[PDB]
Design a protein around this nucleic acid. Structure first.
Ligand SMILES: Nc1ncnc2c1ncn2[C@@H]1O[C@H](COP(=O)(O)OP(=O)(O)OP(=O)(O)O)[C@@H](O)[C@H]1O
Ligand SMILES: [Mg+2]
Lengths: 257, 87
RNA sequence: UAAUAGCGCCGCAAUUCAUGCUGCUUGCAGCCUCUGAAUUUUGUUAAAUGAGGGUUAGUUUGACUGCAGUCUUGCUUUCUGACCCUGGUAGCUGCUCACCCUGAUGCUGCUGUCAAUAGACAGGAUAGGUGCGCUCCCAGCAAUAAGGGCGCGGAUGUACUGCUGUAGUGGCUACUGAAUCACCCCCGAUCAAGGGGGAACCCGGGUUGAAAGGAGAAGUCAUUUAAUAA
């Protein structure tokens, strides 16, 4: 059934070319060639994790005859209370090398040994504040003693952790802040979700003054809330035989917030 | 190795009874029959190393059986040596 | 499905110098663009090694005389190429097995089709596991390493593949199928023998892969298979 296909397509994530993603990709590319470490900060639902994943697909591994792959960008997300072993496990496994049993010094040597040789330029770390305080000595070691830009990513809590150590704060002093949507930027964005993401059988006029009051109060400028409010409304509407979102099902969805 | 009929024929002639399935008379006679068929092939096929292993085993068994019989009963031993044409 | 490990090779990457690369101080300074040693790393349409069995009096490595001109032989071996096969029936013969457990330097392992019996038919050296191999590892079998269990008969004075057996797997001899080549094609000779006709390229002549040799006799050693024996 056709409705089955739309319900199964609207639950599934997609990536939209917002100016905040474009801005990061160029900023990281400066830091990549410059080999300078830095961090990315911003509130929880600004879409930081997606902008980075999207950037990893700008830089698939590179290869030529006689050469092993350069793997220019590495991406990881640590587990909670990440020890040095857990970090080294995640770097090594992202490079797809087998991890054996070993002491932390065997993992550390194994990690330097695959960040050399296999060429890496940049290491991107989501949720950096899961790192245990001592592991930062191992992050600093990587960044100073290899030609690698390290890019920490996280919320305002990360800086509350970083401020606890001068040695780290200073390696990673440069930053970019993601913000929230407003004014014309929030209005222009709603038209992109209407026409790129939702793709319903007829126009829902989501950029209209009556609809933008409902969306602005419901979403408060987070791209996250805008995405999941608009999908939930599109999904519910389609089940009722509606070829569009309507003000009443959109308010039914918004009222759950 | 011997045909089925040839074993049955040899065991019925050297066996003390039809049920004498494995007396020394029977075993020595059977070995003598094999050895007599193997010397005719091994004198011709001089390159057939795998058959010299078979012959040297088969002669050495015959000798053990005969030495056992000699002590056990010299009359049985003497008759058996005659009936097989050995020296 | 599985093959994680161990061991031996092959490069790939450094890191450290020299038997190397710039100088003149002919022994220092300097680095790794080469050519090489040492350690450590790796398994990346990286690169390099890469043992299914066979086939040519094959080509090049040659001698002499001032790099040019004469003469030239087909011996014994190591590689690189190329091509062919993955066999046929006619006897002789060794070993292995009542039936079980452990499973050995044990056997087996490719693609496609039909059967889905255990085997045919058509392809083939990419041929179980990894970059490549093993006595290692995985899967199936295991009587043919070995040890142990143990049934009924024969013998039973110590001997007893010595019974439970028609198959499995080898060995040897005779005939036979394909390649009997070195750029291809064709006709021949193998204790000798060469000859004839073309394609491609270079500047009517060449070219159309290279390399090694002091030989015989005898004793001895090491491992590795069989036999015998205490
Ligand atoms: N390019 C994009 N296209 C579509 N949706 C996006 C995009 N960027 C961000 N989003 C929205 O954000 C979601 C991605 O995860 P989300 O942004 O909620 O987590 P996050 O901000 O990475 O989390 P945290 O900051 O806690 O680590 C998407 O499902 C979507 O709703
Ligand atoms: Mg994140």
């Amino acid at each position: 059934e056709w409705l089955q296909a739309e319900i199964a397509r609207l639950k599934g994530k997609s990536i939209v070319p917002l100016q905040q993603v474009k801005t990061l990709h160029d900023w990281l590319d400066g830091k990549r060639k410059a080999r300078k470490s830095c961090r990315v900060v911003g509130e929880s639902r600004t879409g930081k994790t997606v902008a980075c994943d999207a950037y990893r697909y700008r830089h698939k591994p590179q290869q030529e005859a006689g050469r092993p792959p350069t793997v220019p960008v590495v991406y990881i997300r640590p587990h909670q209370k990440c020890g040095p072993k857990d970090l080294f496990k995640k770097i090594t496994e992202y490079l797809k090398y087998r991890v054996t049993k070993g002491t932390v010094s065997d993992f550390r040597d194994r990690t330097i040994e695959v960040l050399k040789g296999c060429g890496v330029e940049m290491l991107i770390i989501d949720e950096a504040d899961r790192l245990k305080p001592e592991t930062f000595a191992d992050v600093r070691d990587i960044a100073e003693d290899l030609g690698i830009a390290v890019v920490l990513v996280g919320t305002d809590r990360l800086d509350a952790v970083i401020k606890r150590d001068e040695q780290v704060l200073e390696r990673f002093r440069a930053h970019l802040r993601f913000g929230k949507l407003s004014g014309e930027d929030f209005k222009n964005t709603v038209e992109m979700w209407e026409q790129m993401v939702l793709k319903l059988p007829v126009s829902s006029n989501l950029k209209s003054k009556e609809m933008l009051r409902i969306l602005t109060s419901a979403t408060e400028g987070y791209i996250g809330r805008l995405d999941e409010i608009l999908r939930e409304a599109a999904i519910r509407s389609l089940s009722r035989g509606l070829k569009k979102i309507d003000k009443a099902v959109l308010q039914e969805v918004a009222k759950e917030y | 190795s011997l045909s089925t009929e040839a074993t049955a024929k040899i065991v019925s002639e050297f066996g003390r009874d039809a049920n004498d399935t494995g007396s020394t008379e029977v075993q020595v006679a059977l070995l003598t029959a094999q050895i007599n068929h193997l010397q005719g092939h091994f004198a011709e096929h001089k390159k057939d190393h795998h058959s010299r292993r078979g012959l040297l085993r088969m002669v050495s068994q015959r000798r053990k059986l005969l030495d056992y019989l000699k002590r056990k009963d010299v009359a049985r031993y003497t008759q058996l040596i005659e009936r097989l044409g050995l020296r």
